[PDB]
Predict the 3D structure of the following.
Amino acid sequence: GFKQDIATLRGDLRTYAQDIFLAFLNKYPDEKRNFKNYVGKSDQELKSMAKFGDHTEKVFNLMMEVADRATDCVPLASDASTLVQMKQHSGLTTGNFEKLFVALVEYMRASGQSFDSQSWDRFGKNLVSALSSAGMK
């Protein structure tokens, strides 16, 4: 289920975080506009850049804590506030977050490990709702 999936991703989080963030940047090429320093880089070149492995590990470190504090795949209002208020996440919309979770769910489905993909899709939809409620466009 959802709780076990968190421990599964945590067991190899730098590998999952990189493979899921590239799946995201390659399904939605427009999203590399937000990074600018990821443009004209193949997946193997990105996997050798410092602000890629470090950044993607930090995203997933926090995303698992948000998932771990969730009730029934609904994130805490405080966690939604923290993603909204982050000086890093100003001039993003809920659509940026919506696209990441489409990529993570599709990753999980085509992985043939026993992830609860339905719960990650609910968690994504619920997080995007809470980011709205907390003030994000």
